[model samples]
Target: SNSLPSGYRFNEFEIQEAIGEGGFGIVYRAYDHQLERTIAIKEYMPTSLAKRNDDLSIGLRGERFGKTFQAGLNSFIQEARLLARFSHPGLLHVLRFWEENGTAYMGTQFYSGTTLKNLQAQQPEKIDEAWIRRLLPPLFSAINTIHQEGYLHRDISLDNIQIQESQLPVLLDFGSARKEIGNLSDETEIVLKPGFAPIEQYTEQGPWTDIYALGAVLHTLIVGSPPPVSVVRSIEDSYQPLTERRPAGYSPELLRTVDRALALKPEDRPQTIDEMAELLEHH
Candidate 1:
């Protein structure tokens, strides 16, 4: 839900036109009227959930009647709260946040440069081990901070990771983040970009809900494409063995860490982002 506040004209910004649209919202590239710059504005659409009423109903049907709906609201509020509390070079900075007309709006530093998705599309073959090594540490550190703050980035994909001018990685998109531990039913049903999600995400178990996606991101970066989405009877049956798809020149330790992070069982994966970072660092 998004609406501009009354008398909230941006002396510095002139809304240009819509640049893109996604499941949650529409993004516009606007001219910064005050600073004479350009920035992206994301206006979340409340109706984004209309198509998923069945899923929401399934998850919210009985237990604590409105708990699921409240959880969704809390998740949004928590994400805004977390972004407000976090200040890091490797993370997207929220410049401001406010509510208007019963809707919420968040203003963030306009990140310039390519998203990891575009980078992958442009230079699929060039994204090698060296590239992964250079970017993964900073990204991992950023993730570590969020995890330490007691939140899980339920959706971590190439599209959510951006590469700035300095070639440093910055994480974006926290609409699905949650501070509470995930459960078996509703948690697994959390929306994820298909190919990037892990098996445990489908069942809603463990602390490493995002770990599998992190590994998938790394895998996509290294191999130029994500692993095939498998339809297996169990989590153990849904994975592509890392060794089979891993590219050449990657160290054994690195492969091991990635594989472990992508483990079918969430418990088998690294427990914390810091732990994953350490492995990435040493390997």
Candidate 2:
């Protein structure tokens, strides 16, 4: 209901239907009339802070919400511009973006696939360590690209990942707007993924924040669920080492590496993607 109506038009794109949405935005599968192709367009409309007006422009909940809304809008445009520059296979290509109505919209390549979480739900038994290994190289490369640009994904849960028909995994939703909004206040309560978020997210965030999240995704794939909530783990540290459980089909070295990535402290984890990729490679 938060999305635009079907057949909505702007410039050369026509909205087919909303293909995805989250706290920060909505994604529409649209027909590109100019190129005669289909593309996904993401509109920045934070459901909690903004809404559609009778004029179809995004209006804030109150005058006091202007600062937060504008801050996120700025980041949303920045993210779209940054993403448009990259052509990584593991990174979805941003086609174009423009200010429309009142808020902004980003157009990306329309990709068809199931989320990694859905695939795991349907066939948990098939997601072996080998299957995961096949996914890591490109994923790591994609993460490396973002990091090299001095940007942290800030959101990388299983659902943010899509496995293409060719078995290629693509990371979606940089959500830079979410990060900027969350950074603005401690009380704001930005959307947080329980097990996927690490302790540093509560106090500080850096590349290590993403490292813990990706490790949590790996934990989910291997153990059929993520480790305990990080805040809880910080207090009592209930994380079960992958080396101890030794899930069948995974080598001991790989298990040890995963456990290392899940370290409760940022100081204890790999500080960079290169370091993490090197660790994954040695295993």
Candidate 3:
């Protein structure tokens, strides 16, 4: 892990330690010697299985092969573009990007907070009704911004939403998001985390594919577990009658707002995040 690729030297960033690994690559937290700050450097794994060697001819061929490898390159490009297009208080901020050796890399503001997944794991007992009320507004606002910009976040799971503080929920991971209109097709082969994706998303049904995932997140925050994915029943199926589900102690309007967002039919859901936010605010 200490081995650094040739021609790559951190002029200012002193590699501190490996943070974690994901499907696409490994993340490291490095200290910026020049700026005296901490930065997260993400190094993407080469798409091809071929190992990098010191041979000039082999290295040149590997660089050429990497572009055609498709998947990894596609993800790297998509993630870079996704981060470049958006700016929100709740979204992760990208600091810089560059291509080095046979791989691509990006630097982002290092978040010192815990992921919602970690929070849920540590304080299962604290995830209650009041906590849900505290968390949902910013979550909804972030999702709303994504929609307003004409995109769908195909993947929305607890692991992707980072909780820096109890009062703020930061949305991360837009790798699966796209500007495509309408439903996905049978041929689409994206890996979706179960219990977070809705039936329609699995079937390539339509836009607002994220509604079910939002409901699942809210459910997890309130009940400490996501709603069962196999339940197939409408929002009404898992809980009490709509009226009782939203009582005086609970925000009836907010519950209804979530209900509409989680509607079985995509068309029945709010057309824009702003519209949904407006309803929740007015109610």
Candidate 4:
């Protein structure tokens, strides 16, 4: 009910199947007839406030939701424009973006892979230190480039990152649009993931915001769960440092670095990717 029908054509891309869905949007596996290649098209559905009509155009659920929907659509297009400019092995490559059927769509390279979240669920015990180390370079470099470009991933979690069959990782799904829409609309749940998002995400976000999330991702790997909600930590600060856990099968140096990255204060955390990379290298 949330996806475009199969064989639906939009410009040069034909929807082959609905591959994914989320609170923010739907993703379709589409084939580009002009380029003769498969592409992933992410549609800005925002099911909370908008819906597909009999005419196949996005319509607001209520008249009052118009402004919020427009704001989200604009933000979606803006993110698509920015993502289309990014080219890196670790980042999902965007081929093009367009507005159609009263919503926006971004066409990116179709990756055949599973998210770390899924992989973790399938084989939780196999995610060891060496595996984490192997995942560092490309992920770090991709994040570094985004930071260099004066942007934040805004959403970096286990599910948002994919590991290809070749074991290469690719960052995907910038949820700024979703965040904006959720902020504008009276959505039920928090836009940001509870544990991965840092305190600054609700206020001021920077590279540090992403660093916190990256650390949380690592934390989940080691501890079998993400740390407490950041806003709660901002209040009483109940988060336990990774170093204190002394989890087995990982180096002390690595745990310490993770703790530093997960620091409560933004200033206390690694301010740059280089600094964090160096910290990670110490393990």
Candidate 5:
């Protein structure tokens, strides 16, 4: 059986290659003939009740899930709009989006870069405050923009950050972003990234929820792996103190800030990005 080949056209753009896939979308490196430039395109694809048809169209599984699909499809488009409105360099800027072939597609400037995950792999040695100071402020600003705009970036792991030339941190991926509501249900999978996600991600969300995930990313940089899952931490609280997680050679002040951010209780963490970054600045 042959897969759908590249070069499939969508409006003025043609697919160049598949770059990423997620629970709700597939992203591709696409080319626009009008501008003769490459842009990133994401095809809305929620596996809960939808799949791609042979001709690059998305189709719902059954009538029962049709309403659910519509609900998600609407949010996907709105997410594009929200990103399009942002002007921060650290965050992604949406150029345009349109619906076609029964799915939504978002376009954004394409950049060649490496993920923080890749950067960590290359550095081998644990990241220190010197590196943290250089790389973290932009991401903090990006997250701050989203929170200030009244949304939560439910995804904030190391893999979600991209490093362009001179280590410019670009916060990428917001497919898991959601309103900071207090009544979310248990069964809803809010795009969990175990080591980075805190206990509240399973139900309800707050600014502090992202704080926990951000803390976990800091923990990973110093620890070289995600800290233990929140559930495991909740059950036994065996997480080693950030500074003690050696051979990582983390600074006491830096670990203290990250430790506070990764606290188990949401209230124990900084309630906002400003609070988190200010504390780091002071430390």
Candidate 6:
């Protein structure tokens, strides 16, 4: 839930408007006169556990929210710290973060661009492999870095990718970020991404988990919408292959790679990011 008003100041940055919100985070467009530039600031305000009050401060909805709120906040700060140490054109550039008003906030270098969701909406036509090929491999390299650092960016979808005029895919929304955990609990501090999220996200996650999401994203590009939820596929495996829908446009090898990643079982998907990238390379 967002309640920040325009002209409200956080440190040296003045809020312009909210960009969007998620399970435990809210992004805003703000100006930093100290450095004379605009930046995106993400606040750790889980709507289920907290609310922004008339005093323009963040507070928990009740005492019972204290424990779960703390867990999510810790993960939020951990993600900020992890991202601040990494540098890549395809990943977000975390600038700074600080705790205040019983909440945490992280800022990043803002860019004027559109999310892949909006891009796809504006153009309903099928996205070309030539374009997907050029943009995605580099993003896999960036994901590999995150996996290498022992973190899982559990949220991966068209909505989380911002494409600049340069056509480079800039990964967004790491608030769903979490360290690898065993036997996932939907009730725990984790964020479950629909459609893009795989079966491992519900339990016993590993590096291969995010690969399923990458495959889901690619599936959306080909079809202009997300594939069926994992629960449906797990039950009967009724989802059609990419080549089956549009047989003439996509390569069999590429479709196979996407399908392998979308497999309901972890062992059935590509076992590692390196292997997933290798599959994409075969295209």
Query: What would the per-residue lDDT of candidate 6 be over residues 1-283, giving only the tens digit for each residue?
Result: 4658779898789999888776567889999989999999888877777888878778888888677778777878887887787888878899889998788888898967789888888864636878888877778888888888888778788877888877788887664433212112245435566688886665578878889998989888876677787877788877887756665578877888888888888988888888887876643
Would you list the C-alpha lDDT of every candidate in the order shown? 0.64, 0.84, 0.63, 0.86, 0.76, 0.78
| lDDT head-to-head 1 vs 4, winner | 4
Task: Judging by lDDT, tell me the better candidate of 2 and 4.
Answer: 4
Q: Which pairs of residues have clashing backbones in candidate 3?
A: none
* TM-score-better candidate, 2 vs 4: 4
Q: After superposition, how far is residue 115 of candidate 6 from its true place, in Å?
A: 1.9
Residue-level lDDT for 90 in candidate 2: 85
Name the best candidate (by TM-score). 4
CA error at residue 258 for candidate 4, angstroms:
0.9
Q: Write the per-residue lDDT of candidate 4 for residues 21-72, one digit (tens) a residue.
A: 8877898999999989999999998887888998788988898888888998
Regions of model 6 farther than 4 Å from truth: 177-190, 281-283
| lDDT sort, best first | 4, 2, 6, 5, 1, 3
lDDT of 4: 0.86
Encode model 3's per-residue lDDT on 1-283: one tens digit a residue: 3234333446777667777655445577777778789887877643223344563112323445443344455566677777677788787778888776556667877777788888889986766657776787787788877777777777888888888754588876754422110112222334565666766765444346776677667656655566555235544455432345553445677667666766656677765655666665753
Count clashing residue pairs in model 3: 0
Model 3 spans with C-alpha error above 4 angstroms? 1-9, 46-69, 177-190, 203-207, 230-255, 278-283
Q: Which candidate is the best by lDDT?
A: 4
Look at candidate 1 and give me any clashing residue pairs.
12-32, 12-33, 12-34, 13-33
Q: What lDDT is reached at residue 216 by model 1?
A: 79
Instruction: Find the number of clashing residue pairs for candidate 5.
Output: 0
| Model 1 residue 250 lDDT score | 80
TM-score of each: 0.74, 0.89, 0.74, 0.93, 0.84, 0.85
Candidate 4 runs further than 4 Å off = 186-188
Lowest lDDT sum, 10 consecutive residues, model 5, at: 177-186
What's the lDDT of the predicted structure labeled candidate 2? 0.84
